[PDB]
Each structure stands twice: as C-alpha cells, then as structure tokens.
Write an enzyme that holds these catalytic residues in place. Structure first.
Site, PDB file in Angstrom:
ATOM      1  N   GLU A 215       4.033 -34.062  10.483  1.00  0.00           N
ATOM      2  CA  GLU A 215       5.379 -34.611  10.539  1.00  0.00           C
ATOM      3  C   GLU A 215       6.237 -33.922  11.593  1.00  0.00           C
ATOM      4  O   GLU A 215       6.876 -34.571  12.422  1.00  0.00           O
ATOM      5  CB  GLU A 215       6.006 -34.524   9.143  1.00  0.00           C
ATOM      6  CG  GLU A 215       7.487 -34.905   9.055  1.00  0.00           C
ATOM      7  CD  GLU A 215       7.847 -35.250   7.631  1.00  0.00           C
ATOM      8  OE1 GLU A 215       7.493 -34.478   6.715  1.00  0.00           O
ATOM      9  OE2 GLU A 215       8.492 -36.296   7.412  1.00  0.00           O
ATOM     10  N   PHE A 216       6.201 -32.596  11.563  1.00  0.00           N
ATOM     11  CA  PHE A 216       7.027 -31.783  12.446  1.00  0.00           C
ATOM     12  C   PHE A 216       6.195 -30.816  13.275  1.00  0.00           C
ATOM     13  O   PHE A 216       6.738 -29.866  13.848  1.00  0.00           O
ATOM     14  CB  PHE A 216       8.094 -31.023  11.660  1.00  0.00           C
ATOM     15  CG  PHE A 216       9.068 -31.809  10.792  1.00  0.00           C
ATOM     16  CD1 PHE A 216       9.793 -32.891  11.339  1.00  0.00           C
ATOM     17  CD2 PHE A 216       9.255 -31.448   9.441  1.00  0.00           C
ATOM     18  CE1 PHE A 216      10.699 -33.608  10.534  1.00  0.00           C
ATOM     19  CE2 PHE A 216      10.162 -32.166   8.639  1.00  0.00           C
ATOM     20  CZ  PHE A 216      10.884 -33.246   9.186  1.00  0.00           C
TER      21      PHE A 216
ATOM     22  N   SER B  12       2.045 -30.027  15.394  1.00  0.00           N
ATOM     23  CA  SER B  12       0.746 -30.426  15.910  1.00  0.00           C
ATOM     24  C   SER B  12      -0.164 -29.215  16.039  1.00  0.00           C
ATOM     25  O   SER B  12       0.307 -28.073  16.029  1.00  0.00           O
ATOM     26  CB  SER B  12       0.845 -31.306  17.151  1.00  0.00           C
ATOM     27  OG  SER B  12       1.523 -30.663  18.217  1.00  0.00           O
TER      28      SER B  12
ATOM     29  N   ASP C 222      -4.651 -27.601  -2.701  1.00  0.00           N
ATOM     30  CA  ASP C 222      -4.805 -28.786  -1.854  1.00  0.00           C
ATOM     31  C   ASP C 222      -6.216 -28.932  -1.299  1.00  0.00           C
ATOM     32  O   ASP C 222      -6.422 -29.214  -0.109  1.00  0.00           O
ATOM     33  CB  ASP C 222      -3.673 -28.894  -0.822  1.00  0.00           C
ATOM     34  CG  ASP C 222      -3.544 -30.232  -0.132  1.00  0.00           C
ATOM     35  OD1 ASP C 222      -3.854 -31.269  -0.752  1.00  0.00           O
ATOM     36  OD2 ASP C 222      -3.124 -30.262   1.044  1.00  0.00           O
TER      37      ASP C 222
ATOM     38  N   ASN D 224      -9.202 -30.530   4.717  1.00  0.00           N
ATOM     39  CA  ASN D 224      -8.792 -29.124   4.716  1.00  0.00           C
ATOM     40  C   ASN D 224      -9.984 -28.189   4.607  1.00  0.00           C
ATOM     41  O   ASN D 224      -9.823 -26.992   4.365  1.00  0.00           O
ATOM     42  CB  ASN D 224      -7.797 -28.830   3.586  1.00  0.00           C
ATOM     43  CG  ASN D 224      -6.466 -29.542   3.732  1.00  0.00           C
ATOM     44  OD1 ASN D 224      -6.066 -29.953   4.822  1.00  0.00           O
ATOM     45  ND2 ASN D 224      -5.759 -29.700   2.633  1.00  0.00           N
TER      46      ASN D 224
END
Ligand SMILES: C[C@@H](c1cccs1)c1c(C#N)c2cnc(Nc3cnn(C4CCN(C)CC4)c3)nc2n1C
Ligand SMILES: [Cl-]
Ligand SMILES: [Cl-]
Ligand SMILES: [Cl-]
Ligand SMILES: [Cl-]
Ligand SMILES: [Cl-]
Ligand code: NA
EC number: 2.7.10.2
Length: 264
Positions: A18-19, A21, A135, A140
């Site tokens: 989202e915010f 990279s 998570d 991941n």
C-alpha cells in the site's frame, strides 16, 4: 543523497504494498544481494509507528534461525522506513504454488513433509523466543536452494501472551483468533501452517469468507488433488482442529513420527 541511494543499487522490484515496495538490491561495498523493503514512515507516536517498530524488533531477534530470513539493517530516511533482509533466490512459496497450479504438478508428500518440518522448525524458534507470527501463508514463505524454506514478513508478529492482536490473512485465520480468544496464540500459526501445506498439495484457492470458510474451521480439510498417506492427512486434519489445544505445538510437530522420514 540518501543512504539507500548511495550504498545500494536496485536490480528489480520484487514486492509492492500500500505504502511501500520491495527491491532486490546489490550492496555496493560488500557485493551481496539483499531484499530491501522501503515503506512510508508512519506518524510520530502513532500505533502505526509502534506496529512498524515491532517488525524491526521482531527481525532483530528472530533472524538467527535457518528457517527465518536473516536481517541485516533497518533505518529511517526523510519520509521512509527501510528494512534490508536476506534475499531468497527461489522466490515465494505462493509463486511456486501458482506455477504448479498451471502445470498440474504439485508438491509430493515427501516435499510437503519437508515443507511442514522446515517451517515447523522456524515456528519452533519463534515460539521459544516468546513471539508468535500471526500471518503464515505461502506469500510469506521464501525459498532458497536441497530446498530451504524460510519465514519472512514479520509484520503481524507479537509476543506470545499479547492482549491485542492484528489478525492475519482471512484465508488462513483460525476461528478462535477471529473471536478474540488469544489464549492459544501459537496454535494460530499451526492452523495457518496446515492450510499452507494444503495449498502446496494442490488445493483450490482457499475461501476468504462464506460457507466453505466455516467448513474448514470445523476441522475439515479442503480437497487435495493427490493421494496422501492417511497418517499425513490426519496430521494435517488435527492441525486444523477447532479446539486449539488439540492441535500440536511446534515442538510436537517437529518431533512427530510422520515427519521422522523428513528429518535431515
Ligand atoms: C517480505 C519482503 C521483505 C520484508 C522486509 C524486508 S524485505 C521480502 C523478503 C524478506 N525478508 C524477501 C526475501 N527474498 C525474496 N525473494 C524473491 C521474491 N521474488 N523473487 C523472484 C523475483 C523474480 N524472479 C524472476 C524470480 C525470483 C525472489 N523476496 C522477499 N520479499 C518480498
Ligand atoms: Cl548500507
Ligand atoms: Cl512487484
Ligand atoms: Cl498466499
Ligand atoms: Cl489460497
Ligand atoms: Cl477431513
Ligand atoms: Na508489525
């Protein structure tokens, strides 16, 4: 004139959020390749900052193990937070799974037990450091090459007895965590690891919500497109038991008889 700009060369983008990279970068002085995430720096004092800092604190204790990605450094620039970690040359487990889906050839039982054991050894380290991951999912877990599987993405990590939990991916989330019963946090990682192995075994895309979501949380394994031994299938099934106390711990998992064949 930044540290990131001056000490590294970016080779390729490997992640996007989202915010932030993630880039594969070569560090200029030492010559080696790293995965560097660059994210917008949260506002001072916020619960977003505390969240971002738990990730830095998590990597800085959890990286000593062979089945968690190594951490090298973290720093703040002007408006950005950076984390430089190990680069795993084989990519994510999710990309391997996607490829396998297209070609109709999946991880076989011996490779699934090796996946289960390796990531189980990583969870065992995490849990003995008094932390939980929160998570676990194929996107991941990262692959280095025998194959080595390594847990990355520590952005939901919290202490084992935490009263406040940011829950992970809906596809992998145990029901007790959704209901805010945080009494058995380690067993959320076990539940998510089971469904991670089911993905690898060739299952269809898991549900985010709905009837099938609830079906799984009764302790029913999704359909797997291959023959697995009954004892392996039953290990996976008890790992998604609706009572978290019935699910094995990470220590019990790595010592399991079913996984004795996979032990290197
Ligand atoms: C979660 C994030 C970070 C969190 C904090 C800092 S960075 C992170 C790692 C860590 N830690 C990490 C480690 N290795 C890799 N490796 C990779 C990915 N994609 N690929 C592929 C590129 C295209 N080519 C063609 C085939 C390989 C390789 N990707 C990683 N990512 C995204
Ligand atoms: Cl540097
Ligand atoms: Cl990308
Ligand atoms: Cl995933
Ligand atoms: Cl999925
Ligand atoms: Cl079942
Ligand atoms: Na975090």
């Amino acid at each position: 004139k930044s540290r990131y700009t001056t000490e590294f060369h970016e080779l390729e983008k490997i992640g996007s959020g989202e915010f932030g990279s993630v880039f594969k970068c070569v560090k200029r002085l030492d010559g080696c390749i790293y995965a560097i995430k660059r994210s917008k720096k949260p506002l001072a004092g916020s619960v977003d900052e505390q969240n971002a800092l738990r990730e830095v604190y998590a990597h800085a204790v959890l990286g000593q193990h062979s089945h968690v990605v190594r951490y090298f450094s973290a720093w703040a620039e002007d408006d950005h937070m950076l984390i430089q970690n190990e680069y795993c040359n084989g990519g994510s487990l999710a990309d391997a799974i996607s490829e396998n889906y297209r070609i109709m050839s999946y991880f076989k039982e011996a490779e699934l037990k090796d996946l289960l054991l390796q990531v189980g050894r990583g969870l065992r380290y995490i849990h003995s450091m008094s932390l939980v991951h929160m998570d676990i999912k194929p996107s991941n877990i990262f692959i280095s090459r025998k194959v080595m599987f390594k847990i990355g993405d520590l952005g939901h990590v919290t202490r084992i007895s935490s009263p406040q939990v940011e829950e992970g991916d809906s596809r992998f989330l145990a029901n007790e965590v959704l209901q805010e019963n945080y009494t058995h946090l380690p067993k959320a990682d076990i539940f998510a690891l089971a469904l991670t192995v089911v993905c690898a075994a060739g299952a269809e895309p898991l549900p985010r919500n709905g009837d099938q979501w609830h079906e799984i949380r009764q302790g029913r394994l999704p359909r797997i497109p291959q023959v697995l031994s009954q004892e392996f299938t039953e290990l996976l099934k008890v790992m998604i038991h609706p009572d978290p106390e019935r699910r094995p711990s990470a220590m019990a998992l790595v010592k399991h008889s079913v996984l004795l064949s996979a032990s290197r």
